[PDB]
Amino acid sequence: GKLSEQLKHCNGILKELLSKKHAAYAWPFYKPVDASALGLHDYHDIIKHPMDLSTVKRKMENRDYRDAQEFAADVRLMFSNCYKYNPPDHDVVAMARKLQDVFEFRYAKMPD
Ligand SMILES: CNC(=O)[C@@H](C1CCOCC1)N(C[C@H](c1ccccc1)c1ccccn1)C(=O)c1cc(C)c(=O)n(C)c1
């Protein structure tokens, strides 16, 4: 089916985002933000829907994503949270922008 093929494309993108090739800028997005650990006591007041690649991986493994759009919405939410919370000149924002460039260019090659 088309939905199967498009979700294989998404799974390939997910595997690439988690790969050693992108680890230098992808690592901030590997696991949920631990606000308490970092003293970011405003994080959950500002970010109502946290997202990270471990959560995307769990949802893909559990067949939670019914289509590519649902997968893309979660990956883009992860970047949006980073752009919303952090000052735009912070290193983590530069790293989000680099990983989003990897995501958007490969996502755009979606099989019809
Ligand atoms: C204990 N947590 C961390 O130190 C790590 C996690 C360690 C476990 O794997 C996931 C990342 N960071 C990244 C960290 C950082 C600390 C605080 C403020 C912003 C980023 C970072 C990034 C880039 C460069 C230097 N440091 C975060 O939680 C993290 C990530 C994102 C996307 C974010 O928006 N925020 C606010 C925090």
From Swiss-Prot:
Domain Bromo: 1-110
Protein localization: Nucleus; Chromosome
Record note on domains: The first bromo domain specifically recognizes histone H4 acetylated at 'Lys-12' (H4K12ac). It also specifically binds histone H4 acetyl-methylated at 'Lys-5' and 'Lys-12' (H4K5acme and H4K12acme, respectively). The second bromo domain recognizes and binds histone H4 acetylated at 'Lys-5' and 'Lys-12' (H4K5ac and H4K12ac, respectively).
Subunit note: Homodimer. Interacts with E2F1. Interacts with (acetylated) STAT3; promoting STAT3 recruitment to chromatin. Interacts with CTCF; promoting BRD2 recruitment to chromatin.
Record's function text: Chromatin reader protein that specifically recognizes and binds histone H4 acetylated at 'Lys-5' and 'Lys-12' (H4K5ac and H4K12ac, respectively), thereby controlling gene expression and remodeling chromatin structures. Recruits transcription factors and coactivators to target gene sites, and activates RNA polymerase II machinery for transcriptional elongation.
Other facts noted in the record for this chain: Some specific inhibitors of BRD2 that prevent binding to acetylated histone are promising therapeutic molecules for the treatment of cancers or inflammatory diseases. ABBV-744, a small molecule, has been tested on tumors with success: ABBV-744 antiproliferative activity is mainly restricted to cell lines of acute myeloid leukaemia and prostate cancer and is able to displace BRD4 from chromatin. GSK046 (iBET-BD2), which specifically inhibits the second bromo domain, is a promising therapeutic small molecule for the treatment of inflammatory and autoimmune diseases.
Family: Belongs to the BET family.
Protein name listed in UniProt: Bromodomain-containing protein 2
Lineage: Eukaryota, Metazoa, Chordata, Craniata, Vertebrata
Encoding gene (name): BRD2
From-to range in the entire protein, with total length: 344 to 455 of 801
